[PDB]
Design a protein around this ligand. Structure first.
Ligand SMILES: COc1ccc(-c2ccc3c(c2)COC3=O)n2nc(C3(C(=O)OCC(C)C)CC3)nc12
Ligand SMILES: COc1ccc(-c2ccc3c(c2)COC3=O)n2nc(C3(C(=O)OCC(C)C)CC3)nc12
Ligand SMILES: COc1ccc(-c2ccc3c(c2)COC3=O)n2nc(C3(C(=O)OCC(C)C)CC3)nc12
Ligand SMILES: COc1ccc(-c2ccc3c(c2)COC3=O)n2nc(C3(C(=O)OCC(C)C)CC3)nc12
Ligand SMILES: [Mg+2]
Ligand SMILES: [Mg+2]
Ligand SMILES: [Mg+2]
Ligand SMILES: [Mg+2]
Ligand SMILES: [Zn+2]
Ligand SMILES: [Zn+2]
Ligand SMILES: [Zn+2]
Ligand SMILES: [Zn+2]
Lengths: 324, 334, 334, 324
């Protein structure tokens, strides 16, 4: 408990020992990290959130992440929350976002993978699952994460937004939806193209912070921020990154074992018999993660330079462990 | 031509004579609704399935088709003045006429044709007669389920597909897996395009296609990729949905009465609830005639002019009727 | 027009004068439905809540009550002839009168009163105008969700509670968890008891209670456990649901006209689908009068005679009206 | 492969090594045991069930049992299926049930706990969970297990009943609902009362098997049969029984840990700090399992004598471990 309170002092740092916090909290990393961030940002007072209500909702939300899913679980959620909390604190964005925008980004991060079954949208579509039927094969999981995250507010003593005005609730809800729907990898190339356009036309205020003077630009930055947090594993200290790689490959390989036993075509990087884990990480960095983080780094220059350096060091480490 | 080789009733002969106009713009769809005992969608869909030989092509058991159509029609609301089974029947039949345009002869496969007419049939099913924004503002279960995003269009799809699971309702039971996967994708792409939030981008793409328009030796449109094929089918069904002002005036006037009854009821619900009354939903501060002229000038004529260019000159009489009706409504403005 | 300003409109004053009968058997509920612009459930629930001081007792904000009532009423189907918002308003008002019977003076708590009146309000919400068996035989999604077991009664409850989550609809927001759990249990026990499959066991239990009937110091029923208290509330609401033949004949006949319209519509759907036509649903082979005498002799009279024994002699005039109406229907049979 | 085939030779015996089968099948005990039983009973030929359709439905059903739940998982499902299969085979029921009734009992067994979250109905009710709202706090999970088991027939190549006639489908669906809704412990006392009445008025055919000449009696026996299978753990060899007790207590204590952290009242026998594992097992046997199994044993006398003897031996063993 002393040891937990001590790990939690690193909540404003890139590279928080999130797996240690998961162990020390009795598998409550999302609850303890969200509560710590809400206290640090004074969101309970700003939004008149009863503390019992916040903890009941966080326990409820965390309980709806699957303990049997190796990657898309409550530890990933806690990690995305905490990574978004650090990116919101970047000097280039100081005083740019309102308290409601900050609440939206953090809540969006907390709920963004809730009730993830550990299989892809394409798996749910191919099996004619009830989820794919309900969501017309379109951002199936991302739509579901949102509906679950909002629906859990109706459980006993779970409505953390009970003291927001209707106008606050409507704005918070629209921003959360816009953010989580943007975590669908189908939207990655269009999000990145828009971030690059903003970098090429970047304006700063006289205080040297980003100028975002319309909803479109404000929500683009929040979408790309939470997308960066979601795609942040290769930017973390290598000891953390390697644990995340082991977890995503366990999850992918289990999907491929389900595809194989069902006579389905095995999804890319899901065949444990035809795998190159290290080459796949170098490819993920070269094609997805480095392009995104290099553009983010230009938007907030020079705030993210150490994150980009770590990304490049970690890319060289995976390259160096690709077998013969 | 309905063959006759036996004596039949009054009502039967009149219904049969009206159904002979199923391949024409300006079908007497309200008369068919009355004559069929409020089964316009069932009788019009069945007639079009026969006209296109879809039962034979897709091995649809006739009992299954009739059961599915009556089930689908039963999930349109009898108390909704505009977004009901008569509108569904009208969009199906309008789409059926647009598929037959000379510029599209032999362009679409039987499965694409099936997708366009099935999408038309289901595109407003279980419509409550209020807008997405009303469902969003009340924190409706539907708005929660669909994250405030194309709420009703998502729902229409889910319902239209779910109704295939009722007893003897699976009209696709004899499709192969590959046909079902392709049909499903096309139907989703078409119905989600009927959200008016999508209209400006749809119209932009149709405009781009007109400018880069390629024709075959036959003088018929060249559509050689899914993106172009689905864009035409999306715009085709959206034209069918927005076709009321292009119809013979006696039809157009009834469609206007119905949409304004539905809008005014929504405004009466907003008023009683202390909500902001939605645009053209306030019966105390409405200009039905000005709104139709605005609807034509800013939505319907821009779409239909662009459609008429894609299929030039096939849609000239439709555009002429639209321009005449616009002048009629204009002339009734105080 | 002269704007209104804190005085009733003439139509509102006429509605107020009709609502002076809210404590009487035989309220002009159809006239209330017309005068209120098809808001009988909202206006009658609001009147009864004010009369029983339930807003102060349960700290229910008036805007929340009105919002929830309009929402609930809006989820009754305007196209369904019998199982609609007028039927809900009638069961509410009938329950309200039964709760006031001298034999029950000071017996029930405010929470039990709230449970009986709320249960009555929600007991048929979102009724599609067809029977459980119709929904089971068509493999409807509702029958799938509820395992063919009290399908509509389960749905009415789920919808009545789910609508509390719409914007400014949670009328129970100020109740304690203990109050909410008790209210919820009582409401569920009552509405599930409106399934006619439960009628014989409910009546068997009411008879047992009449036989072992104990009064108190003041000649009022003694109910000293949950089992007997809920039994009486279940039978009370079931009598209210089955009250139409106990009303003045001008009201009873409007109810018979509506149930037969609803039943015949179900039979027309069964006929067109090739299904067996349900009992009393064939408009070509029905005896409305024989069916009402049967309904009374086998279902309504045995229930009301037993209720009348429980509350002796408070229900004598209700039982006399029932017997007079039974004689009237019998005398109209060829 | 060869070891699995060897263990599955025991599929017609009480006391099958179901945990070993779970390990050898790669956590597919439900799929392999159902497939074996369908093949043994010739149900694929009788009901024209395509073998690929059967295996796809079984793996889909098995996948909807939660891998993180210690007791109410695919191993429990496999166990209840196999236990029902042995009970249907009893001499007293030879040629009594039709192939459709046998199919109904084995299908109901397979689906009877699907999508169990590892918490009780009361926990779902107290939290205002979406399931409890849908089901009006009434047989919440039992209704849900049925809805799920039927809905999964609609996934791609899952409709194992596609070649039944309409009348066969209507009959099967009614029987399956009747059987699963009877696994609700709220129905146990009325079910046992009716089984006792049947034993008191027991008739046998001219061939000496149970005489059941109406639906009410036939469904009564199938309901009690699957209820016996569900409550069969204390009747198994003690090494199997103790493994089941370890699992149900892990599941209960996890529920109590969730109640405690939420500030809820801890459910009976869910408090790991105030537990009587051994006294609870003896109470369970004395008040529920022994009255049920003694009555079943009367109904099929003497077929269940060894099962009843094992139950009484295990009851004495646990009694011997209860502190003073
Ligand atoms: C620690 O390494 C990882 C962490 C996280 C993810 C990841 C997987 C799926 C999603 C996301 C991230 C965000 O939204 C998703 O749907 N991946 N994904 C890969 C590879 C992959 O296949 O990436 C391509 C995908 C994301 C299109 C194998 C290389 N590695 C990693
Ligand atoms: C015969 O006249 C009409 C027919 C149909 C429609 C219509 C209404 C709503 C939707 C659609 C069409 C398609 O998707 C929808 O959500 N309207 N709508 C208008 C006006 C209107 O407000 O237009 C709104 C635009 C954005 C649809 C008053 C002029 N008139 C008519
Ligand atoms: C004014 O006359 C009526 C009013 C109300 C009802 C009624 C119908 C269905 C339900 C209930 C009441 C309560 O729960 C139900 O499911 N019936 N039902 C009949 C007949 C009938 O079939 O009654 C037998 C039913 C109740 C099983 C045709 C004679 N008449 C009337
Ligand atoms: C290996 O021993 C066990 C196995 C299974 C079960 C069990 C638990 C819950 C349900 C069922 C069985 C069937 O339907 C249910 O809702 N129990 N339950 C107990 C105790 C218990 O609490 O029993 C009372 C329950 C059955 C209400 C601790 C003593 N032990 C065992
Ligand atoms: Mg995700
Ligand atoms: Mg629409
Ligand atoms: Mg009812
Ligand atoms: Mg169970
Ligand atoms: Zn994620
Ligand atoms: Zn439409
Ligand atoms: Zn009723
Ligand atoms: Zn079980």
């Amino acid at each position: 408990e002393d040891v937990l309170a001590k790990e939690l002092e690193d909540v404003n740092k890139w590279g928080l020992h999130v797996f240690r916090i998961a162990e020390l909290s009795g598998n409550r990393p999302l609850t303890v990290i969200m509560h710590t961030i809400f206290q640090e940002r004074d969101l309970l007072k700003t939004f008149k959130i009863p503390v019992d209500t916040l903890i009941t909702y966080l326990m409820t939300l965390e309980d709806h992440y699957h303990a049997d899913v190796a990657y898309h679980n409550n530890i990933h959620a806690a990690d995305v929350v905490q990574s978004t909390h650090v990116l919101l604190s970047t000097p280039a964005l100081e005083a740019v976002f309102t308290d409601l925008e900050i609440l939206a980004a953090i809540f969006a991060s907390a709920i963004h993978d809730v009730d993830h079954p550990g299989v892809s949208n394409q798996f749910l579509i191919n099996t004619n699952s009830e989820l794919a039927l309900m969501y017309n094969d379109s951002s199936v999981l991302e739509n579901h994460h949102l509906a679950v995250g909002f629906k859990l507010l109706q459980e006993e003593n779970c409505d953390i937004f009970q003291n927001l005005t209707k106008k606050q609730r409507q704005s918070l809800r629209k921003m959360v939806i816009d953010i989580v729907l943007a975590t669908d990898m189908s939207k990655h190339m269009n999000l990145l193209a828009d971030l690059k356009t903003m970098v090429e036309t970047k304006k700063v205020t006289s205080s040297g912070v980003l100028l975002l003077d319309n909803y479109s630009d404000r929500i683009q930055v929040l979408q790309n921020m939470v997308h960066c947090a979601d795609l942040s594993n290769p930017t973390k200290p290598l000891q953390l990154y390697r644990q995340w790689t082991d977890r995503i490959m366990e999850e992918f390989f289990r999907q491929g074992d389900r595809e194989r036993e069902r006579g389905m075509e095995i999804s890319p990087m899901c065949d444990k018999h035809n795998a190159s884990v290290e080459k796949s990480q170098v490819g993920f960095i070269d094609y997805i993660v480095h392009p995104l983080w290099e553009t983010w780094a230009d938007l907030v220059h020079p705030d993210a330079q150490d994150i980009l350096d770590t990304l490049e060091d970690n890319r060289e480490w995976y390259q160096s462990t690709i077998p013969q």
